[PDB]
Copies of this chain bind each other. A is one copy, B any other.
Amino acid sequence: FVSNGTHWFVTQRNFYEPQIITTDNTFVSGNCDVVIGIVNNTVYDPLQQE
């Protein structure tokens, strides 16, 4: 989860090539947890599809 001060995006340790957080590109276990590092941002689910 990386940001340029904004535009929080997701990429790997290969190239910047930023991507929208993209729920399918994340892993969820723990929900809003007491874990360090929550930046309180949101991710679009590709299947919102509203």
Interface residues of A (CB under 8 A from B): 17, 19, 29-30, 47, 49-50
Contacts and interface: CB of A to CB of B under 8 A. Distances in A.
Nearest to A25: B27
Contacts of A50: 47, 49
Which label, helix, strand, loop or mixed, suits the secondary structure of the A interface? loop
Contacts of A30: 17
A4 to B, nearest CB: 18
A1 B17 CA distance: 23
A49 B29 CA distance: 21
A1 to B, nearest CB: 18
Contacts of A17: 29-30
